[PDB]
Amino acid sequence: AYMSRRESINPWILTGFADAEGSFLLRIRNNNKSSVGYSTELGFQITLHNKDKSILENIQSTWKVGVIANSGDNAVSLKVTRFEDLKVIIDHFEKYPLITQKLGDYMLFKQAFCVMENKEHLKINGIKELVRIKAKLNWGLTDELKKAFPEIISSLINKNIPNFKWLAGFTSGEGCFFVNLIKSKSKLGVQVQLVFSITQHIKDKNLMNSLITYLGCGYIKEKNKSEFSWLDFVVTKFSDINDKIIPVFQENTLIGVKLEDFEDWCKVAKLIEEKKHLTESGLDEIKKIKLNMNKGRVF
DNA sequence: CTTTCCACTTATTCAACCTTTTACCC
DNA sequence: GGTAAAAGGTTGAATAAGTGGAAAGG
Ligand SMILES: [Mg+2]
């Protein structure tokens, strides 16, 4: 395997994608063999379905770090935990910063990086500090870690969209270009509606709200699934999609298989611009485009 | 002793999917 | 009087996270 077979991508796109996908990791493993009885591993990771391996390669090729591996049969991962390589990641994020609640996680990661850069994690005081940091990262401590270090453990990130490149990267993870086919009392009996969405956890409500000001269109939907809730930024007005959404991503290129879902959705947009969705022949072409996009896509 | 990477797991958070109802164009 | 836009859900697997094992040189 080669570090840069695939092309690199734009660092703001990389950052948008990183706001939408991936997590920092701080492992603190019980370890017989370590002087202190624990060892650590620090890093950053992204796990995607096999379909979107090209993206991991894009990133690897941009940073020149990271390992790409199988992640079970269905998925692949990029993990950076080589310690000195984390300087490349730090250097990337200082210059092209994250803006979702994940920024907070990057702050934990930096702090843990400091402790390790000084080698404090090799002694009991440094392990204690990493425990306090890990306590706030992702899912926090295992029950077993809490017994070992029962010490007492220590606010929402509020940031603006930096530019459209960030937005192309973020959409490449969390966006959806959908062709909705409404059973309708129209002539053909089916209405074609283009839907754009970006799906996000509730914590990033402010970001989602500010997408409305940013794109000059769309609205927020609160959705739920019994115990769990999430948000959608949604655009359904056709003239907004054609004059606002489409040009943005024509100028700022999506990455991964979603690029192909996007061009397929634009093909339908040209058809609707021409009123062709209102004839049988055009409805059928759309039905065929939809059939083979998104979950229906083979290549 | 410690770093690094490789194999592999699991559950809920997303993307993606649908129907029905209301807005509004004409 | 007919097409567009929004309301109002559902669906399932990809992503969010994680775990053990161990090669390799320090
Ligand atoms: Mg995500």
Superfamily name with CATH number, domain A154-299: Homing endonucleases (3.10.28.10)
Helix A280-291 and helix A258-273, axial crossing angle in degrees, nearest 10: 170
C1' of B13 to CA of A280 (Å): 38
Q: Classify A189 as helix, strand or coil.
A: coil
Every domain of chain A with CATH number 3.10.28.10 lies at: 1-146, 154-299
Q: Classify A21 as helix, strand or coil.
A: coil
Output the CA–CA distances (angstroms, integers) from residue A222 to A176, A230, A262, A265, in the order listed: 16, 6, 24, 25
Positions of chain C reached by protein Cβ under 7 A: 2-20
Q: Which amino acid is at A46?
A: I
**Residue A173, marked binder:** yes
**Rounded to whole angstroms, how far apart are CA atoms A47 and A73?**
12
Radius of gyration of chain A (CA): 22
Query: Experimental method for this entry?
Result: X-ray
| Domain spanning A1-146, CATH class | alpha beta
**Residues near A194 by Cβ (< 8 Å), separated by ≥ 6?**
A177, A178, A179, A180, A236, A238, A241, A265, A268, A269, A272
- For A230, phi then psi, to 5°, come to -150, 170
**Residue A264, marked binder:** yes
The answer to whether A246 and A236 have CB atoms below 8 angstroms apart is: no
**Rounded to whole angstroms, how far apart are CA atoms A142 and A176?**
35
Q: Which of residues 37-76 of A touch strand B (CB under 7 A)?
A: 39-41, 47, 67, 69-72, 75
- Edge-to-edge strand order for the sheet containing A190-200? A175-183, A190-200, A228-235, A219-225
> DSSP letter string over A256-288?
STHHHHHHHHHHHHHHHHTTGGGSHHHHHHHHH
Q: Which amino acid is at A248?
A: V
**Rounded to whole angstroms, how far apart are CA atoms A151 and A145?**
10
Half-sphere exposure of A256 (CA within 13 A, CB side): 24
**Rounded to whole angstroms, how far apart are CA atoms A262 and A245?**
11
Output the CA–CA distances (angstroms, integers) from residue A260 to A10, A65, A160, A177, A235, in the order listed: 19, 27, 28, 10, 20
Record the tokens describing residue A277, joined without a space. Answer: 């969705």
Buried residues in A93-119 as b, exposed as e (16+ CB within 10 A): beebebbbbbebbbbbbbbbbebbeee
**Rounded to whole angstroms, how far apart are CA atoms A251 and A237?**
21
> DSSP letter string over A46-111?
EEEEGGGHHHHHHHHHHHS--EEEE-SSSEEEEEE--GGGHHHHHHHHHHS---STHHHHHHHHHH
- For A47, phi then psi, to 5°, come to -110, 120
3-state helix, strand, coil in chain A (%, to 5): 50, 20, 30
Cβ atoms within 10 A of the Cβ of A286, count? 21
A175: left (phi over 0), alpha (psi -120 to 50) or beta: beta
Cβ atoms within 10 A of the Cβ of A281, count? 8
Q: Classify A161 as helix, strand or coil.
A: coil
Q: What is the resolution of this structure in A?
A: 2.4
Record the tokens describing residue A61, joined without a space. Answer: 């090729």
**Rounded to whole angstroms, how far apart are CA atoms A265 and A182?**
16
Block residue for tokens 């991964």: A256
**Residues near A87 by Cβ (< 8 Å), separated by ≥ 6?**
none
**Rounded to whole angstroms, how far apart are CA atoms A232 and A205?**
9
| Strand B contacted by A186 CB (< 7 A) | no
**Residues near A29 by Cβ (< 8 Å), separated by ≥ 6?**
A38, A39, A40, A41
| Strand B contacted by A2 CB (< 7 A) | no
